[PDB]
């Protein structure tokens, strides 16, 4: 899975989605806006790695009865995966505005383009609303239609709650370091990342396979939230220690005063002098201050701590998969974990 | 219609909407965020005129069979009206960021308030998503559920297209005055205002009354698009000439270079010297340029021009209402026009 041919099949759907949203004989009185929206979609939607959309297809293929897999049902699963990518695209447009970011996917953040600015808020809302038009076109005659619409709206609401908890790291221009606990961290990640990134693809595949039992969705959730916590911890590590040419994004968490995994572990490990460095220099726009924090992270050994976590967490999650209900395919969870951890074994 | 008793009935539902979204035994691990969202709702949702929500109820009462007007079905119509008010609240949060506005509904705009700022961007999305949670709680077992959610999806998408066309007034910091025609103006207002403000309340009332005839919906739409353009022309007059203590908002259209009705009519009426004033001073950040344009609008007699237009258009719209058939109650459309004609807020 996550093969070159699966990517080919998935990518082939995107031009049809753009046609559905911008050139299907609708809104023929406002071609200026529809032609612009095609450019919004081209810049912002297909420019990532598509792990969430591809995972929606893989989940469906592993949950559906083999006999029921047809080219037509697999294409439906691919359309659902593009609906997840429309949600991702929307969330990153708004996130980059909120985080004052420079680059995304190796190009300027959308809001930084000429004649965009705060119009990016509208483009964010427009890209998310688009997915419900796609759902109506392709799924309106199936039993899974309403549960899928409701899952997208509920996951959006949850993601908004997580984005708000993430944003509340700062008050009056200074970080609330005494509240930067691992408990707070885990709550932020659950809501701002794990539901939409990991739960949504798998629950979509379950619904398209006519699996409505809330206990099956809950058994999946326990594993998927553990994978999501690693995924966001890795993101946080790379914000400070990654190469922006490889990640496609310039880090901002130290300047923005975020309750990142690095900040939480730094506060756990700091002696009183190091805690005073955090108090003085964390969450400041001055470049000296951001470099002083990075130097503290190096002094505290946080890169080795992250490398240990990447190894240990893989093995803990693999053990937990073994304990999932016999009713769910254990190999779906192993495949997701292997892709996220960039391991074949 | 728009009576004290109808207002009391409608406001009585608001505390239950807040409870539904923030205190219904959900998300009990993140009370910081749920308590803050209760404040977001309190500030941003209920302090406007509530004409859209009240119109949803009036439409339902005038479309349903009298024998079916139970406490419970009238309450459902009020809940649908609050869902339109949630959509409105979401749009205004974003709009005030995009328009760089100072006040809304008599208070500083949400994004300007202490420790809000760019958090207002997530709050806008969160308020929008919340209306679908309310629809799910109350409507999910009723035949109107899918038509209602599909209508909200479609109206959202159309509103985003209008907000985009509205924003394309300026390119590289100068207004595209050669393109400020009445044809452009009518297209902008149809999409950014008329669908969500007038079509949505009346179509919701129809759906709750189990009225699905595509031809009845189309005849209501035709008149409601005329009403929406009239209403937006009034809004544009208030931006330049309203009393901000009565309207609750300080105008920005001249500074933001908007294709307002006043700008379109100023370009139609201007001599060559007056056109050069528009070219030089429209859509500038400098207070002195905006005052030059306001003074041009005064000298052109745009207040009296608006007054004559509003009276002429009220009479044309009422002539068109008299021509409505398809079993639609003329008095619903007359009551909407009576409520807005000659408004100062
Ligand atoms: O660090 P963030 O949460 O802002 C991020 O991971 C985006 N995001 C937003 C919600 N969940 C994740 P990115 O580093 O891509 O800017
Ligand atoms: O003039 P706008 O369109 O920005 C406005 O009417 C808001 N709006 C946004 C879309 N439709 C209407 P407001 O004057 O309330 O700021
Ligand atoms: C939740 C996080 C870490 C946001 C970035 O997600 P990805 O790294 O999957 O981004 P794209 O491939 O879509 O660019
Ligand atoms: C579409 C428009 C003109 C936006 C403002 O609507 P209202 O003037 O109805 O504002 P509130 O009563 O909701 O504050
Ligand atoms: Mg970010
Ligand atoms: Mg962020
Ligand atoms: Mg990050
Ligand atoms: Mg505005
Ligand atoms: Mg506006
Ligand atoms: Mg206005």
Author numbering:
A (entry chain B), B (entry chain A): 85 to 429
Quote the passages of the study that discuss this structure, keeping the authors' original sentences.
To obtain a symmetric complex with IPPHAl in both subunits, a strong ligand for the Al site like ZOL is required. This inhibitor significantly increases the thermal stability of all PcIDS1 variants apart from D319A, which prevents coordination of Mg2+B. The protonated imidazole group of ZOLAl imitates the nascent carbocation of DMAPPAl, while the central hydroxymethyl group constrains the bisphosphonate to a fixed conformation. With four negative charges, bisphosphonate resembles the eclipsed PPAl moiety and engages with all metal sites to induce IPPHAl binding in its native orientation. Thus, the binding strength of C5 ligands at the Al site correlates with the affinity for IPPHAl and promotes catalysis in both subunits. However, the enforced closed state through ZOLAl coordination does not provide information about the metal-dependent interplay between the Al and HAl sites.
